[PDB]
C-alpha cells in the first residue's frame, strides 16, 4: 500500500486527478509560509531575497490530530509537518496494507522497520526557532520522523533517516530492500518527507541557479531554466513476496531490484553526468534479468533542466531503446517516458517516492497521463525518439496489461549530491483463481476517536462517504468491514454499526449521530476502561442452531470448539462438534451432550469476546453458567 499528501491532493486518488487532467499545480508562495513581496524580487540585490517564489504547496500541511497520536495542544504545533504528515500517511498505509499491531507474525514488534528520506528541516530553523521550548528538538529533529512512527505503533524494529539530498527517499527504499534481503526486517515502512517553511532554502537554491524563475519543472521543453519547489509526504508498506502471499495481503506491485552508484567522473560538484547513469541502468537490467523490450515505460528523474533532461534521456534511450547499426529500432514495443515533476514540482527528498506513487496509480488505472512539461517546443538536444520508438504522451494513451504477462517499469531518483539510484518494478501477482463474494451476510463497521468532537466528525464523514459510494459494488461492505475492523488503529471512544448492506450501516450511524447532535453534552461518557461484568446463563434458554453463525464465520471460535470436541472424545464424553455442524441432532441429544454443548459454547464465546480485548471486571453465572 501507499498513502501520501501531494499538492492539491489529500490522497493518492486526488493525485491521480492531478495527473490525468494534466493539472499543473505551481503557484506563488502562499502567505502562510513567507511573504513574497519582501522575499522575492525580479532582480535580487538585497540579501536573503530570491529570484523566484513559486512552488507547489501542501496547504493542509499544518492539519494534525493531536488526540490520535497522543499529543497535547502545546506539543503538536512544535512538531515539523514532515513528522506529523509522516505519522498520518504511515498510519493510513498500515490501514491500506497488511499491518496491524498484534495480528499476524509479519506484524510483530521488531520485525517492522522504518526508513524515511528527508532533505530539509526548515521547521526547526524558522518556525519553532522563534520561541524555543522543551518540544523544540522533540518536534524538529529528523531522526524522530521514523522514531515517532516506531513509538506510537510499538514497532521496535530499526529506525533510520537517509539524506542523499534530492535522492533521499529512493535511497531509503534501497536501504529498505537491503534489510528485507538481510532478514533484519520483513515488514518495512518506507517514505519520504519534504515540507519547508524557510525562505533561505529557496534563496540558496536560486543563488545556485537550481530553481526556475518562470514556472514549474519543464521536462523536455526547449527553454528549461531549472526545477521548481514542490511538497510531498509518502509512506509505503513493503514485504518479501513469500510472506505477502502467505497472508494474502494486497499487492499493488513488486520491486525486482534497486541499485546505487555515484557520478564521480563529473567535471563539477553539481550536475550528474550520463556515463554513470547508463552503467547503473544496465546494472539493474542485468541484475533483475530483463531486456530493453521488457520495460515499456520509464519514469525519469526530470528536473526540467536542458542539461539534465538531455543527459538522462540519452542514458535511458541508449539503455532501453538502442538503435541497430543499420539504423532500425531494436524495440518491438513502444516506450513512454515521463516525469511527475512537471505537475507537482520537484519534491527533492520525497521526489523518488512521489515518482513511485505515480507508477502505483498508473498501474491501478491502466493509463499513462499526459505530459505537460512541454510548454512550447521539444528540446533540440534530445536524441531522435521516434526513430527509436520512444514517445512523450501529450494526451492520455491506453495502457492495457498483456494477458498472462507483466509489464515492468524503470524509475529514477537522482541527486545534486551526485548519488544516482533507480529501481525496476513489475505488476503484482495475479489472483489465486478469481473474484469471490464473501459468504458472510452481515458485517460489522468500527469507528473510533479520542475526543467526542472528533467522534462526531468521524461519524459525519463516514455517513457522507457511504452516500458517495453506496451503489458502486456489493463487495464494498465486506472489504470495508474486514478493513475497518482489522485494519485501523483504534482508541478509547468507539462506535459500531452492522448490516447486510451499506444502507443499514448508514441508518445505524445516522441514528447514533442524531444521539450525538441532540441530547448529548460536550463531556464524554466514563473513560475508566469501561468496566464489564459478564453474565453466564443456565441451559434453560438454549436452542437449536445456537451459534452456528459464530461456528461457520469465526476461525478462532471453530478452533476452540473442535479442540473441546477432541478433548471430550478422549475423555469418554459425547461429541459436541455435531451440534454446531448439524441442527437436527438437538432433538434427540442427551443431557450430557446438551450441557457440554452449552458450557463449550460459553467458554468459546467468552474467549471470543476476550479476543476483542474486553476486560472483565468480574463474572457472574446462573446455575450451569458459572462453570464457564
Amino acid at each position: 500500500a501507499a498513502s501520501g499528501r501531494f499538492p492539491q491532493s489529500s490522497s493518492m486518488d486526488q493525485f491521480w486527478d492531478v495527473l490525468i487532467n494534466g493539472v499543473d499545480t505551481h503557484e506563488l508562495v502562499p502567505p502562510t509560509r513567507w511573504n513574497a513581496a519582501t522575499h522575492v524580487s525580479e532582480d535580487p540585490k538585497a540579501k536573503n531575497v530570491s529570484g523566484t517564489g513559486f512552488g507547489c504547496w501542501l496547504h493542509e500541511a499544518g492539519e494534525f490530530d493531536a488526540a490520535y497520536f497522543n499529543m497535547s495542544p502545546r506539543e503538536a504545533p512544535q512538531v515539523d509537518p514532515a513528522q506529523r504528515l509522516a505519522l498520518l500517511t504511515a498510519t493510513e498505509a498500515l490501514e491500506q496494507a497488511g499491518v496491524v499491531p498484534n495480528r499476524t507474525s509479519s506484524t510483530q514488534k521488531n520485525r517492522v522497520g522504518v526508513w524515511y528520506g528527508a532533505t530539509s528541516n526548515d521547521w526547526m530553523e524558522t518556525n519553532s526557532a522563534q520561541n524555543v521550548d522543551t518540544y523544540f528538538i522533540p518536534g524538529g529533529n529528523r531522526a524522530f520522523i521514523p522514531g515517532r512512527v516506531n513509538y506510537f505503533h510499538k514497532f521496535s524494529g530499526p529506525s533510520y533517516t537517509i539524506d542523499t539530498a534530492c535522492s533521499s527517499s529512493l535511497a531509503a527504499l534501497h536501504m529498505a530492500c537491503n534489510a528485507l534481503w538481510r532478514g533484519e526486517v520483513d515488514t518495512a515502512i518506507v517514505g519520504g518527507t519534504n515540507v519547508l517553511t524557510n525562505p533561505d532554502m529557496t534563496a540558496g537554491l536560486d543563488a545556485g541557479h537550481f530553481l526556475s524563475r518562470s514556472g514549474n519543472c519543464k521536462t523536455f521543453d526547449d527553454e528549461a531554466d531549472g526545477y521548481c519547489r514542490g511538497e510531498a509526504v509518502v509512506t509505503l508498506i513493503l514485504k518479501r513476496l513469500p510472506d505477502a502471499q502467505a497472508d494474502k495481503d494486497p499487492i499493488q506491485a513488486s520491486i525486482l531490484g534497486i541499485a546505487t552508484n555515484h557520478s564521480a567522473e563529473a567535471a563539477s560538484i553539481t550536475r550528474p553526468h550520463a556515463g554513470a547513469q547508463q552503467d547503473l541502468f544496465q546494472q539493474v537490467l542485468t541484475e533483475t534479468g530483463l531486456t530493453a523490450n521488457d520495460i515499456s515505460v520509464c519514469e525519469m528523474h526530470g528536473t526540467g533542466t536542458q542539461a539534465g533532461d538531455s543527459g538522462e534521456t540519452t542514458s535511458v534511450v541508449e539503455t532501453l531503446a538502442p538503435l541497430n547499426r543499420s539504423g532500425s529500432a531494436v524495440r518491438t514495443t513502444p516506450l513512454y517516458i515521463g516525469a511527475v515533476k512537471s505537475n507537482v514540482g520537484h519534491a527533492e527528498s520525497a521526489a523518488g517516492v512521489s515518482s513511485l506513487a505515480k507508477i502505483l496509480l498508473m498501474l491501478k488505472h491502466s493509463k499513462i497521463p499526459p505530459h505537460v512539461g512541454i510548454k512550447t517546443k521539444l528540446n533540440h538536444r534530445l536524441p531522435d525518439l521516434a526513430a527509436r520508438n520512444t514517445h512523450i504522451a501529450r494526451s492520455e494513451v491506453p495502457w492495457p496489461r498483456p494477458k498472462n504477462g507483466k509489464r515492468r517499469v524503470l524509475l529514477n531518483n537522482f541527486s545534486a549530491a551526485g548519488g544516482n539510484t533507480c529501481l525496476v518494478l513489475e505488476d503484482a501477482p495475479e489472483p489465486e483463481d478469481s473474484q469471490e463474494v464473501d459468504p458472510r451476510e452481515h458485517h460489522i463497521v468500527a469507528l473510533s476517536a479520542k475526543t467526542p468532537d472528533s467522534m462526531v466528525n468521524n461519524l459525519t464523514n463516514m455517513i457522507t462517504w457511504i452516500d458517495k459510494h453506496s451503489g458502486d459494488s456489493l463487495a464494498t461492505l465486506p472489504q470495508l468491514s474486514y478493513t475497518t475492523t482489522a485494519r485501523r488503529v483504534h482508541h478509547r471512544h468507539r462506535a459500531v454499526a452492522t448490516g447486510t448492506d451499506l444502507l443499514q450501516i448508514r441508518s445505524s450511524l445516522q441514528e447514533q449521530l442524531d444521539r450525538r447532535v441532540s441530547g448529548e453534552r460536550s463531556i464524554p461518557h466514563p473513560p475508566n476502561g469501561p468496566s464489564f461484568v459478564l453474565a453466564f446463563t443456565g441451559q434453560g434458554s438454549a436452542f437449536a442452531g445456537m451459534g452456528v453463525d459464530l461456528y461457520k464465520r469465526f476461525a478462532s471460535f471453530r478452533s476452540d470448539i473442535a479442540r473441546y470436541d477432541q478433548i471430550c472424545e478422549g475423555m469418554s464424553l459425547p461429541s459436541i462438534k455435531a451440534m454446531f455442524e448439524d441442527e437436527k441432532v438437538f432433538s434427540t441429544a442427551s443431557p450430557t451432550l446438551q450441557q457440554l454443548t452449552h458450557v463449550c459454547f460459553q467458554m468459546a464465546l467468552y474467549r471470543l469476546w476476550k479476543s476483542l480485548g474486553v476486560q472483565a471486571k468480574a463474572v457472574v453465572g446462573h446455575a450451569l453458567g458459572e462453570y464457564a
Partner: protein
C-alpha cells in the same frame, strides 16, 4: 426435565465430590460473584470440592450474590453487563439489582438476529471506551480473506502552526536597528 438445586440431586453428591476433588484450583484473577453462597469470592479456599456439591444441591441465590457485590462497590449503574449465553435472562437480574439505567444487552437470542443485538450492544460498549484487538476476532477464512485497496480513514484534524512573522530572515546578521 429434572429439578435442579433440590433434594433430587442428593444421591449424586458423594461421587460428584470425588469428581471435584480431581481438578486443579487457583485463586481467581477477577472476583467471582457466586449465587451458591450469595457472596463475592476472591480466594481459592472457597472453591474446594465441597463447592461443587454445595452448588449442585443448594439454591441459586442471585439476589444475595448481587446485593453482596453492589455493597462492595464491585457493581453500579456505570458498569457494563454482557450476556455470554443464549438469551438475556441473567442480565435482567443484574439490571434489577443495580439500577434501571444500566446498559445491559445480549448477542445470541432466538427472536432478534445476532448482528442486531450485537450492534445495539457493542455500540454502547465501545462507546463507553473499551479496548480491542479486532485482528484476533476477524483473523479468519484462510481462503476468503482477500484484501483490496480502499480510501483512508476519516480524519478529525485541526491546524497546528507557528506563523513565520516580521520577515526577520532578511535581516540575518544585522543588529537591532
Amino acid at each position: 426435565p429434572m429439578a435442579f438445586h433440590t433434594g433430587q440431586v442428593d444421591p449424586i453428591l458423594p461421587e460428584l465430590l470425588q469428581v471435584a476433588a480431581a481438578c486443579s484450583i487457583q485463586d481467581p484473577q477477577i472476583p467471582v460473584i457466586s449465587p451458591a453462597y450469595g457472596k463475592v469470592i476472591r480466594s481459592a479456599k472457597d472453591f474446594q470440592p465441597e463447592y461443587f456439591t454445595h452448588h449442585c444441591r443448594s439454591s441459586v441465590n442471585m439476589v444475595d450474590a448481587l446485593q453482596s457485590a453492589v455493597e462492595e462497590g464491585l457493581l453500579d449503574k456505570n458498569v457494563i453487563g454482557l450476556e455470554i449465553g443464549p438469551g438475556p435472562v441473567v442480565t435482567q437480574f443484574v439490571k434489577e439489582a443495580v439500577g434501571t439505567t444500566m446498559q445491559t444487552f445480549a448477542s445470541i437470542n432466538k427472536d432478534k438476529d445476532t448482528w442486531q443485538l450485537m450492534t445495539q450492544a457493542l455500540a454502547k460498549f465501545y462507546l463507553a471506551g473499551a479496548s480491542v484487538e479486532w485482528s484476533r476476532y476477524h483473523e479468519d477464512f484462510p481462503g476468503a480473506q482477500k484484501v483490496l485497496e480502499l480510501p483512508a480513514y476519516g480524519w478529525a484534524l485541526k491546524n497546528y502552526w507557528l506563523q513565520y512573522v516580521n520577515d526577520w530572515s532578511l535581516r540575518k546578521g544585522d543588529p537591532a536597528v
